[PDB]
Amino acid sequence: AQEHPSLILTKAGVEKIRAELGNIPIFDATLEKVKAEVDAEIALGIDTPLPKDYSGGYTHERHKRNFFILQKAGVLYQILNDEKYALYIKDMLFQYEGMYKDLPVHPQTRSYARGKLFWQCLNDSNWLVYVSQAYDCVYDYLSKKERKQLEKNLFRPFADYISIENPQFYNRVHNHSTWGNAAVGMIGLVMGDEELIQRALYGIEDDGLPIGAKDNDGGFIKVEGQKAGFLANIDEPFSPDGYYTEGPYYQRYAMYPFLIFAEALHNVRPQQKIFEHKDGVLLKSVNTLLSLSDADGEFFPLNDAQKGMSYHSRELVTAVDIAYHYGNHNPQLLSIAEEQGQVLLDDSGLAVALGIREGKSEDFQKKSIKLSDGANGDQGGVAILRYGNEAMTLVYKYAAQGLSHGHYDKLSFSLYEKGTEILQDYGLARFVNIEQKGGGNYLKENTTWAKQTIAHNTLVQNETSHFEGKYEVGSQHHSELYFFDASNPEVQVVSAKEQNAYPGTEMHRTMALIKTDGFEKPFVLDILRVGSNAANQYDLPFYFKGQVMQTNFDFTTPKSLEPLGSDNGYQHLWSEGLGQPKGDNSQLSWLENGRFYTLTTATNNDDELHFVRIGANDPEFNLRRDAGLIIRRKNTKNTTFVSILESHGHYSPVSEFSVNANSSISKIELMLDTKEYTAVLIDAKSNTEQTLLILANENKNVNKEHIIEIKGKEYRWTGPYQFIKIN
Amino acid sequence: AQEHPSLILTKAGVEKIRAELGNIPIFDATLEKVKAEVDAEIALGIDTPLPKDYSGGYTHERHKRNFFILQKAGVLYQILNDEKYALYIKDMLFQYEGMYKDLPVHPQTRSYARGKLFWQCLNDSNWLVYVSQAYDCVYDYLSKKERKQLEKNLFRPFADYISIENPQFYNRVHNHSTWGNAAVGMIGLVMGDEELIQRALYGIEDDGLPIGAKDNDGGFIKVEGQKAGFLANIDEPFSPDGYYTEGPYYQRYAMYPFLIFAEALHNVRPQQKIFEHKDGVLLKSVNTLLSLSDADGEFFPLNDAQKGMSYHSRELVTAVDIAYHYGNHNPQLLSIAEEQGQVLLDDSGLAVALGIREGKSEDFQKKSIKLSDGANGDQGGVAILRYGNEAMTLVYKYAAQGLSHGHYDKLSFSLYEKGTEILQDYGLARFVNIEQKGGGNYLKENTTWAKQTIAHNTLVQNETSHFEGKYEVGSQHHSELYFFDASNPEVQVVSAKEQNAYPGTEMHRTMALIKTDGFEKPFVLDILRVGSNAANQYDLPFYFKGQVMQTNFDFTTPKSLEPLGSDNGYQHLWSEGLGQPKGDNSQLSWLENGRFYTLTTATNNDDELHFVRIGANDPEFNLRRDAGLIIRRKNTKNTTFVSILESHGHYSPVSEFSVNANSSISKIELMLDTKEYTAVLIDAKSNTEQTLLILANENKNVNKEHIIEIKGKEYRWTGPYQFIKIN
Ligand SMILES: [Ca+2]
Ligand SMILES: [Ca+2]
Ligand SMILES: [Ca+2]
Ligand SMILES: [Mg+2]
Ligand SMILES: [Mg+2]
Ligand SMILES: [Mg+2]
Ligand SMILES: [Mg+2]
């Protein structure tokens, strides 16, 4: 009964594509490129080496390229009606059949679930997701006899290897299991095997896995009460806003198996209603992921994340095209496709190409957005505040743990200007798929530096990470949204609280992106209110990007670089300079990508200002030599940090003109600093430009009227904040 | 009798321009932009503040902007026939006339020749060069009475201030004097003042200046027996190849007054034959300067040079347009104009716009080139070796001292790939015109770091700079070309010697850019042959750009960073790691801008390999935290360093594919290491690819036959080198 192909590329799709070839430029260009890639590999032959290497090494790269080429050859066979591509697929599949059944477990031992073709079952699963698509395309070209042998001695044993033989890999809520479930489900759908389809959807019953079983990034295999299978992987790690809890770098990775297996289920098993599952979260999550990119389309490096990953990736070409075709045909997705400059060679890519040709493209709007975390949207979140035409972007992370890849980074932020990183989230310590750096795998310093709180722009207490850097503790906690109000494009405000990172301490951080008279550009206002039951040492880092220009405080320069501390990331920071404040406001300015920036922060006489540089205890040169300024406030119980980050002026080494190189801040002052209310007065240097932000800290209700006095003058407003011009 | 304007913009030119407006896009676009700029400044008014500041500060930037705006207003008045612009010029000139005569010497005391409007006479001279052009454009609009007052009480006193009152600035062979001579000459030409015209052409007679006196950059004010004036500044600091001895960054700066005053002389005094002077060197020098830029048009940072200065600068818009119009109408210059995207608003810019419109543009060929230094071309030189379509670029500097801005780095080199710096020349320590960095002026670390030999990719002996870093010694010496042969695009070789940098030591450095079977790309071969009369410590730095990927040697990582040494630049290097070689070849690889690089060097077992980081003894953060690898060879008399720099493969954080990340070098071996002959065998990993470079070291004659034995085998060739495939 079942047609082949039908999962991704459909029979009707092949006919529609063939009818339009030559009149769909983005598709035609992709077809030419892919045909040339596959033809070159056909010329080189068929290589299925005995597996040996980690990522970047020959056997890994060869088996990886093979799965990409097989899927490409499958669609070429169908679209071009050229059996040279079917013959290549047949010959490669049979060469695999000749070796796979006799392979040992992969000789590399790092993985908690060692693969056969690859060092880990994740990559064997990648292979089967792609190869299942190729098999769907050549199914009718093969004889019944050929299909029987491939299914019996290659595909069914492979599907069992990555599932029932490795339930620790397969049966989780984790990107690994999403790939595993998709691999088993895709091949099950092609073969019409109900057992495998059910195993894909609902996982393995009674897996026998014990308590506290972990993998290699610090994460539990199983979580009490959680289901397994594809549907569990949709329900648990996505919020109702389509935010994937591992963060955008890993959301990017998981989007491929999520949307490909969803597409396959939609086409073969429409009764599953997979695109309606969890209030249509998979389709929504594509928009959400695109919103988590900077002006150049590069995903914000939250949690474990390599900088440079972007919506130009193959996963986002796939996700955009599937979301366009199977969703509500959102014309904003077509502008992303135009930027990508390629489409999938299937029904969905054709739909995108036709939408573009018909003049339907609309610009993808990059907006201020509140995203919830947790399956029910009640476990913190992530906020993005954007000014104007994506002119300045603040990312505030008040999220849940994020599973294994999560960082100890409650209430951290990062700042960008038109695709230039200004205040960074470090990302991972890993050179992804570069064999020369620890086999392309996570490095020691991912744990010892990149995950630690001191590596982030957030509060560190007593040189200890949030939750003492203990995964099992952090996994039980999330920061809490206090309020989000981005309605005023000139004054956008978000506020969140964290009281479990350091038991006995309450952190309440409010961030605002504010455009006001006296300043060339919007600035960031950062209020970090700290309450505690004991005198502590508080560190507040700012990991700036660029060349130091000026300070308004003196600092000493040591004759030798010593580490800042001994543990929890401090062992990776060199102490490059130590400043003492000259007064109530301390300022650091720098130049980055032709623009000046100034950090102004409210300082006390006994504060220390630490210039630091990353790179201590880094024997393999695994860390970047980036700099930071850390405010250290010793022997302090309750305190409120108040900072402004300005962007101003410009420099060019062509014109050699320096323009507006100084700050426009005259003064920032806490006018009220209580548990119930915080008030910050901001004075610009030009003319009578004064503004006041007042925060109500213990009642978020939008209709609650507040009455306070500052210097014998009454201020009245409704809701959790007011920003007023002081005349 | 004399028409006005006539120096730069001519009356015939105004008519020709007016006739073509609307049909010359590059010109029309420039006119629109400049009109908007000037109209905005007219709206803001006329501000001539009491001078106070250094560069980047208000009074400097305001008086600087004024001279640019006055020249722009002059050409707008003429082109648009709109007295709005003439009135602005008149009013600003008279506001200047009201204040200039009563000014004190500029209150800042740094300059050896303090200005009146600016901290230095150089900038007062900039002002007069530009304002003379504006005066030429409004000369007939003003009354005789107005002109008489401006000439008597503004222009003539100004011209004397920057010349006869400051002969130490005016009467040199120096970019300062080129600007000063042009300033006096330009105003002299507008006024028809023969005395000033003669003072511009031939300098001050009997200047009385001290010989051996130094400027504030460490170089001599006046050279014994040397002429002064504009013609001397053409003859002396340019070689017969059009290479300006101060280096490309300063050549760029001087190109404006050279070509502007030459144009004025050509138009007003054609009998001078200024464009024929020194065998037409000024026109040639424009091509030479363009050839001294990387693939993005950025000038190589040789000697004092800020990175990022490029042929998009105003000086190169000017130089290109004048060279096109008054030279042989070289169509290659039109492609540079198209890249610049603007032209001068005058006869020369019209000529360029019309050439572009008529389809005459041809691409500017970026070639391998040998450039001599010294007035007669016999004081060393600079060699640029380029592979393919500007695919890899090696810059080898065997030059003379370079006057005050020259660095102590005989035989240094730098390496670029398609506009990406791979091995750097540091450039200057100065943030040009940024007030926050020492008033935008040369920093202490320009002398203590940037000029020193240890900052360069060349030999350092006993932790001492070339010539002991003494100008009075270095200025008397230059390296000597041995041979240059770039005729074979696959195998380009240059060789030079230096025996005075370290008296008693002979340095003979041969560099080659070689494409051969077994390697993806051309590589650089570096042979640094050293002969001495004593056992020395030799350091050879490689200041690489990028992220360290792998080494084939172990190295220790200290718990504290200590400076590498105490003096001569070593005080600015942190010792980050110390390796000992594992064998005869040591290797370091890195990743920069998506490409891998490997340095392989021939090591002895007692060598030290030092990982260093710039930034010690840098209390103001004036230096970049760039890294290097230094080969240290102690207690050694004669030795020959042999290194290869490979470019291979690629990485993308979008695809996450690492390709060809390992070196293709199997072995490099010194097969013969004598004073008379050097032979280096290169083995690629592909076992059948072996090559041999043989150098004859004591006879450069191209027809001299050589017969030598290596491992019992005779080799015969003619000329100073042979590169042969070993079968
Ligand atoms: Ca992080
Ligand atoms: Ca280049
Ligand atoms: Ca230099
Ligand atoms: Mg998942
Ligand atoms: Mg951005
Ligand atoms: Mg001034
Ligand atoms: Mg000076």
mmCIF file of all heavy atoms in Angstrom, chain B residues 562-576:
data_model
loop_
_atom_site.group_PDB
_atom_site.id
_atom_site.type_symbol
_atom_site.label_atom_id
_atom_site.label_comp_id
_atom_site.label_asym_id
_atom_site.label_seq_id
_atom_site.Cartn_x
_atom_site.Cartn_y
_atom_site.Cartn_z
ATOM 1 N N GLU B 562 55.734 35.886 34.471
ATOM 2 C CA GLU B 562 56.874 36.752 34.723
ATOM 3 C C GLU B 562 57.328 37.342 33.394
ATOM 4 O O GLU B 562 57.176 36.694 32.358
ATOM 5 C CB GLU B 562 58.017 35.921 35.308
ATOM 6 C CG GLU B 562 57.644 35.119 36.549
ATOM 7 C CD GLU B 562 57.338 35.991 37.740
ATOM 8 O OE1 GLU B 562 57.952 37.073 37.870
ATOM 9 O OE2 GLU B 562 56.484 35.585 38.559
ATOM 10 N N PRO B 563 57.900 38.559 33.404
ATOM 11 C CA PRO B 563 58.406 39.104 32.148
ATOM 12 C C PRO B 563 59.562 38.276 31.600
ATOM 13 O O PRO B 563 60.339 37.712 32.380
ATOM 14 C CB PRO B 563 58.877 40.512 32.527
ATOM 15 C CG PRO B 563 58.146 40.820 33.783
ATOM 16 C CD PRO B 563 58.073 39.518 34.507
ATOM 17 N N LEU B 564 59.677 38.210 30.279
ATOM 18 C CA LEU B 564 60.724 37.407 29.646
ATOM 19 C C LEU B 564 62.118 37.966 29.906
ATOM 20 O O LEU B 564 63.071 37.198 30.070
ATOM 21 C CB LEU B 564 60.473 37.290 28.142
ATOM 22 C CG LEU B 564 61.466 36.437 27.349
ATOM 23 C CD1 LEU B 564 61.459 34.991 27.833
ATOM 24 C CD2 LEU B 564 61.160 36.519 25.863
ATOM 25 N N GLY B 565 62.237 39.292 29.924
ATOM 26 C CA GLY B 565 63.505 39.950 30.224
ATOM 27 C C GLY B 565 63.313 41.333 30.788
ATOM 28 O O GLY B 565 62.201 41.737 31.097
ATOM 29 N N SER B 566 64.413 42.058 30.941
ATOM 30 C CA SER B 566 64.402 43.335 31.657
ATOM 31 C C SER B 566 64.433 44.584 30.778
ATOM 32 O O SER B 566 64.072 45.660 31.247
ATOM 33 C CB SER B 566 65.585 43.386 32.628
ATOM 34 O OG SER B 566 66.807 43.264 31.934
ATOM 35 N N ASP B 567 64.886 44.458 29.532
ATOM 36 C CA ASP B 567 65.208 45.626 28.711
ATOM 37 C C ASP B 567 64.923 45.394 27.238
ATOM 38 O O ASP B 567 64.700 44.266 26.803
ATOM 39 C CB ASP B 567 66.702 45.972 28.858
ATOM 40 C CG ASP B 567 67.051 46.534 30.220
ATOM 41 O OD1 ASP B 567 66.859 47.746 30.433
ATOM 42 O OD2 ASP B 567 67.549 45.770 31.073
ATOM 43 N N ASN B 568 64.936 46.490 26.490
ATOM 44 C CA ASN B 568 64.916 46.478 25.026
ATOM 45 C C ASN B 568 63.683 45.795 24.435
ATOM 46 O O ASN B 568 63.741 45.204 23.363
ATOM 47 C CB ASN B 568 66.223 45.884 24.487
ATOM 48 C CG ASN B 568 67.448 46.586 25.054
ATOM 49 O OD1 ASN B 568 67.447 47.806 25.221
ATOM 50 N ND2 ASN B 568 68.478 45.823 25.385
ATOM 51 N N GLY B 569 62.566 45.907 25.153
ATOM 52 C CA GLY B 569 61.292 45.335 24.741
ATOM 53 C C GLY B 569 60.917 44.056 25.456
ATOM 54 O O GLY B 569 59.736 43.719 25.547
ATOM 55 N N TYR B 570 61.910 43.336 25.977
ATOM 56 C CA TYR B 570 61.644 42.072 26.662
ATOM 57 C C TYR B 570 60.817 42.266 27.934
ATOM 58 O O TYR B 570 60.119 41.346 28.380
ATOM 59 C CB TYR B 570 62.956 41.363 27.005
ATOM 60 C CG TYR B 570 63.679 40.737 25.825
ATOM 61 C CD1 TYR B 570 64.441 41.509 24.947
ATOM 62 C CD2 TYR B 570 63.619 39.363 25.603
ATOM 63 C CE1 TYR B 570 65.104 40.935 23.874
ATOM 64 C CE2 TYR B 570 64.291 38.779 24.538
ATOM 65 C CZ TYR B 570 65.032 39.572 23.680
ATOM 66 O OH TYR B 570 65.714 39.009 22.625
ATOM 67 N N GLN B 571 60.897 43.465 28.514
ATOM 68 C CA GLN B 571 60.077 43.827 29.670
ATOM 69 C C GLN B 571 58.577 43.905 29.374
ATOM 70 O O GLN B 571 57.787 43.990 30.304
ATOM 71 C CB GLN B 571 60.569 45.137 30.321
ATOM 72 C CG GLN B 571 60.215 46.438 29.609
ATOM 73 C CD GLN B 571 61.198 46.837 28.522
ATOM 74 O OE1 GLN B 571 61.850 45.991 27.901
ATOM 75 N NE2 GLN B 571 61.292 48.133 28.266
ATOM 76 N N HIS B 572 58.190 43.886 28.097
ATOM 77 C CA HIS B 572 56.778 43.913 27.714
ATOM 78 C C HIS B 572 56.215 42.546 27.343
ATOM 79 O O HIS B 572 55.046 42.451 26.981
ATOM 80 C CB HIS B 572 56.560 44.896 26.558
ATOM 81 C CG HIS B 572 56.872 46.318 26.905
ATOM 82 N ND1 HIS B 572 56.210 47.007 27.897
ATOM 83 C CD2 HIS B 572 57.751 47.193 26.364
ATOM 84 C CE1 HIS B 572 56.668 48.247 27.951
ATOM 85 N NE2 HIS B 572 57.608 48.383 27.036
ATOM 86 N N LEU B 573 57.024 41.493 27.446
ATOM 87 C CA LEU B 573 56.558 40.141 27.136
ATOM 88 C C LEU B 573 56.404 39.307 28.385
ATOM 89 O O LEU B 573 57.351 39.175 29.149
ATOM 90 C CB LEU B 573 57.544 39.443 26.208
ATOM 91 C CG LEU B 573 57.622 39.979 24.783
ATOM 92 C CD1 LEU B 573 58.798 39.343 24.061
ATOM 93 C CD2 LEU B 573 56.329 39.717 24.027
ATOM 94 N N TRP B 574 55.214 38.741 28.580
ATOM 95 C CA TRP B 574 55.007 37.722 29.602
ATOM 96 C C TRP B 574 55.470 36.377 29.049
ATOM 97 O O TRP B 574 55.182 36.054 27.900
ATOM 98 C CB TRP B 574 53.523 37.585 29.950
ATOM 99 C CG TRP B 574 52.874 38.764 30.573
ATOM 100 C CD1 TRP B 574 51.818 39.497 30.070
ATOM 101 C CD2 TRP B 574 53.183 39.329 31.833
ATOM 102 N NE1 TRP B 574 51.475 40.482 30.942
ATOM 103 C CE2 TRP B 574 52.295 40.412 32.036
ATOM 104 C CE3 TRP B 574 54.136 39.043 32.811
ATOM 105 C CZ2 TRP B 574 52.330 41.202 33.183
ATOM 106 C CZ3 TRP B 574 54.170 39.832 33.960
ATOM 107 C CH2 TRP B 574 53.279 40.901 34.130
ATOM 108 N N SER B 575 56.178 35.610 29.879
ATOM 109 C CA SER B 575 56.541 34.230 29.563
ATOM 110 C C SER B 575 55.340 33.340 29.885
ATOM 111 O O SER B 575 55.044 33.092 31.053
ATOM 112 C CB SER B 575 57.775 33.815 30.374
ATOM 113 O OG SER B 575 58.090 32.447 30.200
ATOM 114 N N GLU B 576 54.642 32.873 28.849
ATOM 115 C CA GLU B 576 53.413 32.086 29.015
ATOM 116 C C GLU B 576 53.648 30.573 28.989
ATOM 117 O O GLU B 576 52.840 29.812 29.517
ATOM 118 C CB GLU B 576 52.380 32.485 27.949
ATOM 119 C CG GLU B 576 50.938 32.268 28.379
ATOM 120 C CD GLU B 576 49.903 32.973 27.515
ATOM 121 O OE1 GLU B 576 50.202 33.403 26.401
ATOM 122 O OE2 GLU B 576 48.739 33.069 27.956
#
